[PDB]
Specification:
By secondary structure, the protein is of the alpha/beta class. It has 13 helices and 9 strands. The structure holds a molecule of 2 linked components (NAG-NAG) and N-hexylphosphonate ethyl ester. Keywords: Cleavage on pair of basic residues, Disulfide bond, Glycoprotein, Hydrolase, Lipid degradation, Lipid metabolism, Signal, Zymogen.
């Protein structure tokens, strides 16, 4: 696992600073903050204000989020700089206190990629609560790439990419901070997720990997957005955030919690919105950036995906 000094950011900090926001507080003076990293095609609010912005608020957190432009459709490596910048600012901003990271979809891959290649933040993140993270990418994007209708981070999230290869090769498929991964064998976006083992895309060695059906049964069906918004997710979500061990506890959730509807504590307006989650996402993808190659990896990661091929050609250290 890499250690040492962090790679430099390719982006100006004022730009990285532009990407962060806290609900009713400044990053420099925010208390009990939680960082929220959105999925492909969305801004922090589009992903979380019908769900975890309101939910982390009632559990006593000040929701802060990053919104890398354009809608998380860009080089995952750059989206990560926004996260590193934010954590650095909030640990500082809350008095050099560690902070929890809550992610959705690509956001979990960003959290892990930063924890892997930017050693400084390992001591600032208290725990990682990840909903439907695609650490091995997704087998479902095959069409999209042979289809070359893909935004940079779509190329990077396809199983077999130089980026997911680099993450596995650098040792990032193991938990760096106490991590709880909540996911569904019935995810329509990220696959595979059916074996309740290391083969799943959401799985991290030593993490608390919660495959929905392994708790609720083979008939329990929750989708991609419902992995983030459901009532079952709130119960494990809250367990992780309250846990002394940093991961969700079994004693905390059971069969009674196997409710797939949006969380009970949401207003109806919020529940409707949470049910409609992928709409803003799908639109942005159709509407935003495309390309026929995977963006090039940054120097710091090339030696971990040597031989793979990106925009420029074959990868060499
Ligand atoms: C999207 O990420 C790309 C790919 O890395 C960024 O493009 C680079 O711009 C930086 C800093 O502004 C320069 O150091 C590099 O020379 C560029 N590389 C390539 C391949 O383009 C881009 O800045 C990001 N844009 C947004 C809106 O996030
Ligand atoms: P996630 O970032 C979820 C994005 C949902 C968009 C629906 C079209 O995806 C991992 C590939």
């Amino acid at each position: 696992l890499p250690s040492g000094s962090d790679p430099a950011f390719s982006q100006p900090k004022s730009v990285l600073d532009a990407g962060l926001t806290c609900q009713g507080a400044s990053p420099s003076s925010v208390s009990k903050p939680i960082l929220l990293v959105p999925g492909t095609g969305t801004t922090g609010p589009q992903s979380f204000d019908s769900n975890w912005i309101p939910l982390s608020t009632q559990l006593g957190y000040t929701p802060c989020w990053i919104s890398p432009p354009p809608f998380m459709l860009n080089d995952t490596q750059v989206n990560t700089e926004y996260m590193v910048n934010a954590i650095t600012a909030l640990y500082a901003g809350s008095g050099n206190n560690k902070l929890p990271v809550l992610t959705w979809s690509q956001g979990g891959l960003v959290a892990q990629w930063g924890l892997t290649f930017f050693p400084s933040i390992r001591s600032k993140v208290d725990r990682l609560m990840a909903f439907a993270p695609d650490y091995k990418g997704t087998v479902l994007a095959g069409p999209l790439d042979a289809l070359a209708v893909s935004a940079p981070s779509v190329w990077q999230q396809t199983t077999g990419s130089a980026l997911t290869t680099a993450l596995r090769n650098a040792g990032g498929l193991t938990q760096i901070v106490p991590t709880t991964n909540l996911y569904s064998a019935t995810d329509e976006i990220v696959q595979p997720q059916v074996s309740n083992s290391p083969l799943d895309s959401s799985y991290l060695f030593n993490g608390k990997n919660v495959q929905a059906q392994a708790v609720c049964g083979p008939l329990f069906v929750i989708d991609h957005a419902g992995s983030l918004t459901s009532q079952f997710s709130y119960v494990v979500g809250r367990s992780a955030l309250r846990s002394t061990t940093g991961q969700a506890r079994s004693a905390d959730y059971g069969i009674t919690d196997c409710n797939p509807l949006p969380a009970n504590d949401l207003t109806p307006e919020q529940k409707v919105a949470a049910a409609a989650l992928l709409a803003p996402a799908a639109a942005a993808i159709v509407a935003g950036p495309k390309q026929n190659c995977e963006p090039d990896l940054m120097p710091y990661a090339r030696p971990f995906a040597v031989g793979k091929r990106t925009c420029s050609g074959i990868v060499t250290p």
